[PDB]
Amino acid sequence: ALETVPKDLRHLRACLLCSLVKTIDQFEYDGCDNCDAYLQMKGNREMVYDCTSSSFDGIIAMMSPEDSWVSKWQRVSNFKPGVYAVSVTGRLPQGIVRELKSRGVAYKSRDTAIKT
Amino acid sequence: DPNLWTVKCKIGEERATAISLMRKFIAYQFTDTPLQIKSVVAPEHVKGYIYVEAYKQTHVKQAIEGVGNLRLGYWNQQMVPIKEMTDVLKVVKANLKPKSWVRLKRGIYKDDIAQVDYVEPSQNTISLKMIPRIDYDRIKA
């Protein structure tokens, strides 16, 4: 769709769950298109700035997650096709990871990047 | 698995190349000429050429047709072996973490190892810990 495409190359971030690469405007106006009932990051900027960080490396044009080698490797085959990332550094605080396990969402470290 | 094909672009024009190709796809998925491409990989580390991912060499040719960015390499599509579908995703240590050790580019403390104290959420400025090397206004006039 037209909402998953970042409008402007300025002020872009990436999520920690589905690696959603968007503009600061989209995260507040629309939010995470692959998780809206567990994260609820539409309608504010503190929740967008809390979970979602700017600290990420690399972009991918996810189009066909049902048939692709890259999609399986990043465990992003059950997501919506769009702008994704390959290495999203950081970690969620101990305030929203405890509620994700009780609801059935296993928060995985998306950071596939090696350390030294 | 879809196959990785390499294509030339002018220096630094790869970011506009990536976003317009995504938009192209979306712009043509419902017409009579769709795109056979899966993804496009555009690493932060590389320069001068980018990676397009599709089953056959005809597919990329018929897809990158009409773009003024990938016109220059359009005549050839150097492939990589199966073992190179993995090392493209690898990232060596973004680069934004407090209490870390960064260096400068410009200013007076060039190539001087400093430290970060606080990060501004506006993405405008950043706090640095350096040591002043001025003369305290004694030698200079």
Ligand SMILES: [Zn+2]
């Ligand atoms: Zn997500």
